[PDB]
Design a binder for this molecule. Sequence first.
Ligand code: NAG
Ligand code: NAG
Ligand code: NAG
Ligand code: NAG
Ligand code: NAG
Ligand code: NAG
Ligand code: NAG
Ligand code: NAG
Ligand code: NAG
Ligand code: NAG
Ligand code: NAG
Ligand code: NAG
Ligand code: NAG
Lengths: 186, 129, 408
Amino acid sequence: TLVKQLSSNFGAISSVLNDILSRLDKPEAEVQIDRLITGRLQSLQTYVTQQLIRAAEIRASANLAATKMSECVLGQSKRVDFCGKGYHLMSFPQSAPHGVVFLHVTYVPAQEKNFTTAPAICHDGKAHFPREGVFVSNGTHWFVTQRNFYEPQIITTDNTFVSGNCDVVIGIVNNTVYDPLQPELD
Amino acid sequence: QGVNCTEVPVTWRVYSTGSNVFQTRAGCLIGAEHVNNSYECDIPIGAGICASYQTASQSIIAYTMSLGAENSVAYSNNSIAIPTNFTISVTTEILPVSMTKTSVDCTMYICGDSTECSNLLLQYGSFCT
Amino acid sequence: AIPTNFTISVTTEILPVSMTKTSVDCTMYICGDSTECSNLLLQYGSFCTQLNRALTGIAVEQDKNTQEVFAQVKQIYKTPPIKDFGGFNFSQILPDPSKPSKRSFIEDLLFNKVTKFNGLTVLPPLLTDEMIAQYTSALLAGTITSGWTFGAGPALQIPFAMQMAYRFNGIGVTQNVLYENQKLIANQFNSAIGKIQDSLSSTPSALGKLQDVVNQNAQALNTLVKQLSSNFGAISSVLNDILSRLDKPEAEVQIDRLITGRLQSLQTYVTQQLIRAAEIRASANLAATKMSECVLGQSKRVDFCGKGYHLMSFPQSAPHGVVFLHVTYVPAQEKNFTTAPAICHDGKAHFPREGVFVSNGTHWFVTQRNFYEPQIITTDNTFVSGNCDVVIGIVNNTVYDPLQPELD
Ligand SMILES: CC(=O)N[C@@H]1[C@@H](O)[C@H](O)[C@@H](CO)O[C@H]1O
Ligand SMILES: CC(=O)N[C@@H]1[C@@H](O)[C@H](O)[C@@H](CO)O[C@H]1O
Ligand SMILES: CC(=O)N[C@@H]1[C@@H](O)[C@H](O)[C@@H](CO)O[C@H]1O
Ligand SMILES: CC(=O)N[C@@H]1[C@@H](O)[C@H](O)[C@@H](CO)O[C@H]1O
Ligand SMILES: CC(=O)N[C@@H]1[C@@H](O)[C@H](O)[C@@H](CO)O[C@H]1O
Ligand SMILES: CC(=O)N[C@@H]1[C@@H](O)[C@H](O)[C@@H](CO)O[C@H]1O
Ligand SMILES: CC(=O)N[C@@H]1[C@@H](O)[C@H](O)[C@@H](CO)O[C@H]1O
Ligand SMILES: CC(=O)N[C@@H]1[C@@H](O)[C@H](O)[C@@H](CO)O[C@H]1O
Ligand SMILES: CC(=O)N[C@@H]1[C@@H](O)[C@H](O)[C@@H](CO)O[C@H]1O
Ligand SMILES: CC(=O)N[C@@H]1[C@@H](O)[C@H](O)[C@@H](CO)O[C@H]1O
Ligand SMILES: CC(=O)N[C@@H]1[C@@H](O)[C@H](O)[C@@H](CO)O[C@H]1O
Ligand SMILES: CC(=O)N[C@@H]1[C@@H](O)[C@H](O)[C@@H](CO)O[C@H]1O
Ligand SMILES: *[C@@H]1O[C@H](CO)[C@@H](O)[C@H](O)[C@H]1NC(C)=O
């Protein structure tokens, strides 16, 4: 666009300076030239202004790319959807002609099952809460499992902690919590 | 755009015909067949209206777009869903980092080799700088 | 100092997302329907084309901005017909099904508080207010019924009270604190929402950030139109008056002066719109970031999304932007306790596990930071490393071994 503007002839008799100078006696040529200078100077100013604005767009992108490099390649980000959909594990950069390409490796949950749950287990009047897991049931037995992957464990005193009584908890269920030392102590 | 279907008489007037005329908030749409079936956004028109080519006998249709499949979570006070498996997904994210670096000799652009022109460009002070 | 109580605070964050999709017909603005003026305008090359493209590009971005902020959910999730979230009432932020155009109560307020052309036209957005409301309600339904799981992959249902318990763990406060205070927490939450209604309705500047965008664009156009009457060094600002009065060779001079002035005025307008568009785009990028990190998950970034420790965020639509209701945990009613980095017992240095040692003046306990729930100091909530002669602030006490009485 910038180059083509040179042929515009911005109100002048000709877009070509040599034709203006050849055809005219000079006093008029200066006027015809001023018209071309004004238009051509305006064209450069237009070009540069747009380049400054576009440069800002790229700068912002580069700052984002640099941020991603630091947080997704040189570490493991916990920012949701910052480094791909799913739970971020790692990423690998690849170069590109005028930019960077990130390959984001994420963990995505699949094949969920529906379990019955509860906030706590009532054992001998004590409210047992899970440690780093959730209480689930298959309709019969209750188990405790890590929230993000079904891997049911027996509910024991090593998988829970005790706070208060069982009257305060809204949806507590009755069950037995196993003490691993019971068969060794008695 | 912004034109009522009452206007646009039946350069060219080939596509000013009737039958296939649909009034949208975006303007008068001619040549597309409006349907009551929603679909994903294809060619956006505006105000929820999109168009697509349906091969339905290989013709352009207009519709109100769907925002995605409907779903309902089986929520209860005692039901939890837990994944038993997982997949490792790899996605690609593309970001631009830099532009082509250019510079322009303002005198060469404006005046070139014309001395009679470069002597007038001096009257514009520092603009070139 | 350790908190003994807490409050649930809900605050509003207002962000612009998009501008009115304004477009200007360069040729018409400058020349109207004058043939002579149009022919002269052609002598200025591509300037007209560039201006038309610049404004077109902005309009496209305005839809892109909206799409990135709101369309972050693959499916449109609905809430159950029976709303039971453990005492938490979301009826003021969820759509009212009896009125099939809503736009929940809070959204309804936002849309009420915010408040003949020459080549100048306005295009509608691709996403209508109803569609935005549907995306927003989908996000709320997901957030409420499946926590953040729907933002990672499949939506996995979970009881709301349990969801909150997980969000408390993210604060550093043990689950039992929520379950033993569930009624209190739900009540504080519900009251906080009621306060939002009054805050938005009462304060006229609450949505100023959105109104400012509207006002700036309105001024830009009012200015652009007024420039048509400037008469930039011509006998008349009206092209028809020039053409009806002067002969060709003289009219051209007067017209060229108006073309230069009007073209310059339009270029000025467009340049500013590109700069303003960049500001709005940056805002949209921030809003989209917050949507992902505050609504589709639990952010750990300080003061990123409300003061206090982040729990939840509930999006609400607005005319040209998004409103976030940030729910945070704020510590309250702290007490002064005596502390120590370690306890000396039988020459051993005992350090706390995920807690702090405190004293009430006579007895030492292990407490939870950000809440205060003193436990007996035992081998189950402490660990041993090194001897007692290294730690500077170490105090002498007894660590209870819970197995001792089982054996003896
Ligand atoms: C993944 C799945 O099947 N979830 C089912 C749901 O489809 C059904 O509507 C609901 C009521 O029976 O029970 C859930 O466990
Ligand atoms: C309803 C059901 O599946 N119950 C089974 C039970 O029969 C089995 O003995 C136990 C083994 O841990 O696991 C439970 O989930
Ligand atoms: C933990 C919990 O709230 N369980 C509720 C129970 O309180 C309620 O009485 C019943 C309907 O009558 O529905 C259950 O899901
Ligand atoms: C959910 C449940 O089983 N609750 C039982 C309650 O029915 C019983 O009456 C009480 C002993 O009197 O012990 C509770 O654990
Ligand atoms: C100027 C004009 O034609 N306005 C039309 C009106 O005549 C028509 O009855 C109405 C139907 O919705 O739509 C308006 O845009
Ligand atoms: C909801 C609705 O109005 N559906 C009608 C459909 O019953 C009719 O067969 C069709 C004819 O083209 O037009 C649709 O708009
Ligand atoms: C426990 C289980 O079902 N694992 C399945 C495996 O059997 C299957 O062959 C594979 C295919 O990708 O996907 C895994 O999640
Ligand atoms: C232990 C304690 O003081 N809890 C107070 C409660 O008594 C008070 O009613 C409520 C505000 O209504 O704020 C809680 O922090
Ligand atoms: C502040 C608040 O949430 N008030 C709601 C009220 O508008 C609603 O009608 C009622 C229905 O149970 O539940 C209350 O919690
Ligand atoms: C939470 C608390 O008790 N703060 C008190 C403070 O009010 C008092 O001015 C200062 C001097 O005695 O001692 C602090 O422990
Ligand atoms: C943690 C600790 O060691 N605090 C002691 C403080 O009790 C004592 O009063 C002060 C000297 O006056 O020296 C500090 O190092
Ligand atoms: C300031 C102080 O009381 N220091 C005593 C130290 O003299 C004693 O030897 C040790 C037990 O061996 O217990 C420390 O608390
Ligand atoms: C410290 O807590 C214990 C708890 O049993 C209590 O008996 C004791 O009186 C308290 N001391 C002070 C100074 O409050």
